[PDB]
Point group: C3
Chain length 213, copies 3
């Protein structure tokens, strides 16, 4: 009874101590897929905590009955119960904390991934727009002009996506200062690439019209 | 939100494509156990699609929200959302169709298995009834009559079972043209076997009665 | 209807017969950990029985429908069903019985483990109390007194725990009468060890007090 109570409490505390070290990991992942995998793993740990909740509560309930029955050794029991509750609350707090840090990491890696998607698109169009072919016949120029138009339509959509990625970066910086330097530089870099492509596109459009007029 | 939406939709789409491909199997089993095993397996896949509905619905919800906010690039979101919804409907449609076909296969293989159980019993009794030992002593003869009387009751049950098997075959044919030739021939053969056993049993019974009178 | 009914019944009877043979184990564990491991395994089997109920009932329902529709061979169907019901009932009764025996084993091994915990504690304190170093300085002697005082409080708790262990032992003897001789001797031995420690502790305390006066 009191013997089983202490064996159960000791067993749960050993478990808690082991889970505490697992939730003490400061690995937040290197990229989007990496963080997504860690969040799946953290959710499995949270289910494990939930699975032990009943056994934990049984120890507390048994401890309360022992204390209310004025069992001899009552003081040692109460102190052990308070230390037990403390280890459990601490574990839960650490697990919640890591879960939160992983959510922050997820938002950050999404921004890093989004910046790469927009920059890769811009980089490929920069090469396209730098073409030296301005049409060898008037009819050929009409073909290039319509293709340029198709490009601008798509560019307008990407300009709006870039604004959203930047608004997202500004929000990450506001929530706190993690990776502030990298985030600020990537937003400036991305806006700079959009400006460079707008300049390059305008120059090509001007050449094409000059050529056909 | 738009970048993650396209990543999630792409991932769900490739998933859907895999399952679509699996569910396109044209294997319906070679015997009863074979169909039963394919159905267990199909049931797993069905529960799966069901425990994967939230993720698909989550994508549709985001698409709706993104499309409503008339965010630029609205047209792309709608076309992608549309083909997505159709890929999902297609999969659910193909899965349900296979489940139905496996259901048909099951009834058909149960009929085939039932025919074999009845034919095997009949073949074994034909040999017994072909015996020419009518009993030497007065105690042997009645021992033989006793075994025949039990056979008669058993044959009465099997005749009813054969009628049930044939009714089932007629129903299968009624439901569709699958394996009609084989089902038709098996019913005819089974009735013929019953008729032949009735004839052999009668000859055997008469010899036994004539010998003990 | 009928053919699949007998195939399902035969398959369930094979399942039942296998679980029956499994639940026939006479293994109840050699120590506390061992019993706890066997109870976890037993609970998994109890869950399987609950999960299988619908399948058993389904055969029973079909059999009733066949019986009510006066299908031919009604008597064999009724006799096979009554046989099937008895096997399922027998399995459930055997499982319940093993479960109860395992609970009896748990209580007994808890008592054996608790006895060992108290005796190990007494044995280690017996050697400490046997020490003949009563002090060296006016401060070393006070140190020894401080430690003996902490020990007296701990011994007060253990005396109560030994009393609970003996109460548990007499309850085991009253409720099942198994291992009576071993339980009786262990309680006698344990009370004997407390008495011996009380005597040795008082001799030690006397010397410490005398030396400090």
């Amino acid at each position: 009874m009191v013997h089983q109570f202490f064996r159960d409490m000791d067993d749960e505390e050993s478990w808690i101590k082991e889970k505490k070290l697992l939730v003490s990991s400061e690995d937040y992942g290197r990229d989007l897929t990496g963080v997504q995998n860690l969040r799946k793993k953290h959710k499995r740990l949270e289910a494990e905590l939930a699975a032990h909740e009943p056994a934990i509560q049984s120890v507390l309930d048994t401890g309360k009955k022992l204390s209310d029955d004025n069992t001899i050794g009552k003081e040692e029991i109460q102190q052990r119960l308070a230390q037990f509750v403390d280890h459990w609350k601490e574990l839960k707090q650490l697990a919640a904390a890591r879960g939160q840090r992983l959510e922050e990491s997820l938002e950050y890696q999404q921004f890093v991934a989004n910046v790469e998607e927009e920059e890769a698109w811009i980089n490929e169009k920069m090469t396209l727009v730098a073409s030296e072919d301005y049409g060898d016949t008037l009819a050929a120029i009409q073909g290039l002009l319509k293709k340029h138009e198709a490009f601008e339509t798509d560019f307008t959509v990407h300009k709006d996506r870039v604004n959203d990625v930047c608004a997202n970066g500004e929000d990450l910086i506001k929530k706190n200062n993690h990776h502030v330097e990298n985030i600020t530089a990537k937003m400036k870099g991305l806006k700079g690439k959009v400006s460079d492509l707008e300049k390059a596109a305008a120059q090509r459009k001007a050449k094409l019209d000059e050529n056909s007029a």
